[PDB]
Design a protein around this ligand. Structure first.
Ligand code: HEM
Ligand code: HEM
Ligand SMILES: Cc1cc(N)nc(C[C@@H]2CNC[C@@H]2NCCNCCc2cccc(F)c2)c1
Ligand SMILES: Cc1cc(N)nc(C[C@@H]2CNC[C@@H]2NCCNCCc2cccc(F)c2)c1
Ligand SMILES: C[C@H](O)[C@H](O)[C@H]1CNc2nc(N)[nH]c(=O)c2N1
Ligand SMILES: C[C@H](O)[C@H](O)[C@H]1CNc2nc(N)[nH]c(=O)c2N1
Ligand SMILES: [Zn+2]
Lengths: 403, 401
């Protein structure tokens, strides 16, 4: 075989070689001495990143080496020469946004990558206007439960000028209220953002599922607080298909997963606000959000209702309750006619995507620890699939909280 | 320099300083991570010196007379012969350290408790067999399982290796059928076929224990049947599901890995089988539910009368849990040592804390440490891990055929 990583599927016995990794222009955290694959967090410069991106764009429309390609390159360097930055054409932004999704190693939903609605909000000049754009995104994306993948792109970062930022990590989040006894009512993931919303004058609720308002920041201004109109935020009360008491627990989740604190980098340009959204894989809600010990932590409650023996690990009470909670999430979203995908169907699709990308680009960057679902890992085909992880650009990158 | 390591459930942070002790590169580079992939005198002398330094350090006698004179002996033997030999107590220390150092093992809380049988005076396949039988008897201990390793003679420059051809001491046959399907364990079709070719008369069951193919240097391997009385097995039944027992399922008590190489101070032990006890997910999830193994999920789901037509009924998940529960209940009933994945991962977290204090870190392979079901329900899911190769070490080796 070739001087490229060999990649094996242990269920099927099939082999591929990843040649796409040669295109990686950015170092990850691993070295020959030690693997750090499981850690959650990681003039001339701009111009070479820009050239690379324009080359990618022209290769994607099959015009590599043409005068249009050469003219665009010249236009970009003259823009940078005199202004220090450059700007993307509308179709370049569209291509770049889809490519950043395609390149995201942690996303199992990439079979959908070519179907992304790209809203261009590069004309936005105020917090109020960000709010309008965001409500529009939410309405389009939710589409009354027939969810449509989308991204809204606000103005890029500029030399010595402040950033557009959405302070919330998602467009929809539940409040976390720190109680006097030290415990938390609502989502403990969101204690800090809830605390900041109150400081900026939000009148807080007192429930387990209170939708947070948005803190939105335009360049060089304090952030401004905006409450989402409730009719815009689609939620799904959770019930179980056979266990009738489950509805009585008053659990719920929102329909729209919309990540809003990631930086979108395209050709050296940095879009510090570019919230994007798809639809849920059910285990995100049923396993992580509801059962993580540092989240809603409902496993014991549900096991008590199912009358399990919670005093001993070998009864597998945690496993049994987790399964029924995950089943409840699927059933309820299906009943409410809100788009959702189970972990079996999602991982099958990702395997198909792997085959697609092998043919199209000669590999696919994938982070095995994130792609493998948090329940039933080896019951899904991705557990048996070796994966190579590397950074490609355009990319979504985590960015530090602005506060 | 030193990697920051965070637990996302508790918010606690440590720094791994142990990784600086690594002398051997893994498969990753800054360009790409390959963490999910499954697979002369001076050089030997420095590995040997280092191991001896490790040894005298462990008994708190660094720089003592015994330490200086032992370094002399090693040097003299290598200068003269190009190799050397370990003393029994050194071998015992090195075997425990290789277990301690093994990144894919969730059972390492037990690392200091290991019975070491010195079999380096073995000169024939027949002798290998007696040693293996004794190991099995000792480790099994009527179901009260005890960790053990038996170390056969080291590799030598001149000649072929002592090798056990079987990947474990106890495996079930896999019989390829006219229709290309497999009866028994599909993971074992090749070794089954080798046994038949070396004169084994095969059974035709789903759980026929394989004979051993044992190899002394530069000889054809030899076939030995394990006396059935030595091989402890557990019939599988379910606490509430009566029909489960009638699936006729069983597994053997003793997990005993026999194809790995044990490397201690530059010396290589190509046959050095080791055994502990099972974590129940290995049997319940991987061996019985992998599609390329016994693949029983669908049969069981139908017995449970689940809706098999659609993934979103979570029929696979439901069936998998009940199979795992059956494994645990049946081992507990038969009074055979077993540990569930919640208990094992909780003890592994304790091991991590013990090692931080003892050594400043612990090499761990997240993809192998997190169990194949209910991953995020265990504490190890939320624990970042640093992977690297320390020596003494267990390592994979090519099949001898
Ligand atoms: C179409 C339906 C989609 C599904 C089912 C899906 C699925 C997932 C899942 C399960 C994760 C892991 C999330 C976690 O545990 O935190 C993830 C992460 C991610 N997804 Fe997708 N996704 C979808 C759409 C999208 C879209 C439209 C984008 C961007 C255009 C996207 C980009 C990403 C990125 C950048 C991550 C990593 C986020 C992080 O590091 O926190 N996904 N996705
Ligand atoms: C005492 C009870 C033990 C438990 C519960 C345990 C648990 C486990 C588990 C679950 C794995 C992953 C297995 C797989 O999926 O193939 C593993 C791997 C491993 N264990 Fe332990 N183990 C135990 C004893 C031992 C002992 C005594 C040794 C050596 C002296 C050992 C050395 C290893 C090694 C080298 C691996 C990686 C094997 C490979 O690469 O295939 N273990 N162990
Ligand atoms: C510290 C840090 C780093 C990082 N990369 N990330 C985070 C957000 C964490 C990751 N894990 C839980 C939480 N993120 C939860 C929100 N993720 C939904 C992803 C999703 C699903 C479907 C469609 C979409 F468009 C997006 C934190
Ligand atoms: C190709 C390859 C490489 C490698 N390093 N390894 C393998 C054996 C595979 C790994 N995964 C399934 C199968 N190994 C069989 C399971 N091994 C039992 C581990 C164990 C458990 C409890 C106590 C013990 F002492 C030992 C294959
Ligand atoms: C420590 C570990 O890397 C961390 O808990 C990861 C594991 N895999 C994950 N996978 C997904 N999809 N989402 C996550 O938040 C995590 N958390
Ligand atoms: C491709 C992937 O690395 C492979 O399926 C691994 C995943 N994790 C594992 N974990 C354990 N404990 N045992 C295994 O055999 C595997 N297989
Ligand atoms: Zn790595």
């Amino acid at each position: 075989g070739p001087k490229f990583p060999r990649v094996k599927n242990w269920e099927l016995g099939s082999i591929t070689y990843d040649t796409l990794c040669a295109q990686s222009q950015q170092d990850g955290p691993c070295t020959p001495r030690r693997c750090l694959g499981s850690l959650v967090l990681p003039a001339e410069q701009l111009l070479s990143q820009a050239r690379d991106f324009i080359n990618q764009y022209y290769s994607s429309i099959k015009r590599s080496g043409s005068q249009a390609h050469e003219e665009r390159l010249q236009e970009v360097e003259a823009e940078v020469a005199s202004t220090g930055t450059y700007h993307l054409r509308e179709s370049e932004l569209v291509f770049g946004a889809k490519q950043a999704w395609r390149n995201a190693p942690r996303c199992v939903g990439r079979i959908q990558w070519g179907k992304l609605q790209v809203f261009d909000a590069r004309d936005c000049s105020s917090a109020q206007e960000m709010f309008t754009y965001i409500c529009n995104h939410i309405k389009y994306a939710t589409n009354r439960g027939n969810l449509r993948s989308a991204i809204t792109v606000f103005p890029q970062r500029a030399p010595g000028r402040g950033d557009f930022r959405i302070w919330n990590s998602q467009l929809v989040r539940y409040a976390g209220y720190r109680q006097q006894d030290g415990s938390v009512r609502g989502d403990p993931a969101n204690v800090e953002i809830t605390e900041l919303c109150i400081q900026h004058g939000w009148t807080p609720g007192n429930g387990r599922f209170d939708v947070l308002p948005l803190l939105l920041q335009a360049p060089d201004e304090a952030p401004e607080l905006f409450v989402l109109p409730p009719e815009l935020v689609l939620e799904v009360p959770l019930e179980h298909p056979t266990l009738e008491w489950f509805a009585a627990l008053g659990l719920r989740w929102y329909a729209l997963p919309a990540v809003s604190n990631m930086l979108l980098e395209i050709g050296g340009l940095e879009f510090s606000a570019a919230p994007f959204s798809g639809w849920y894989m059910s285990t995100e809600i049923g396993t992580r959000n509801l059962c993580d010990p540092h989240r809603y932590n409902i496993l014991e409650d549900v096991a008590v209702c199912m009358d399990l023996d919670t005093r001993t690990t070998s009864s597998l009470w945690k496993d049994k309750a987790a399964v029924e909670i995950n089943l409840a999430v699927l059933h309820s979203f299906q009943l409410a006619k809100v788009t959702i995908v189970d972990h079996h169907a999602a991982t099958v699709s990702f395997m198909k995507h792997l085959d697609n990308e092998q043919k199209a680009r000669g590999g696919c960057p994938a982070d095995w620890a994130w792609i493998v679902p948090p329940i039933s890992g080896s019951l899904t085909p991705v557990f048996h699939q070796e994966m190579v992880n590397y950074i490609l650009s355009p990319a979504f990158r985590y960015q530090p909280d602005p506060w």
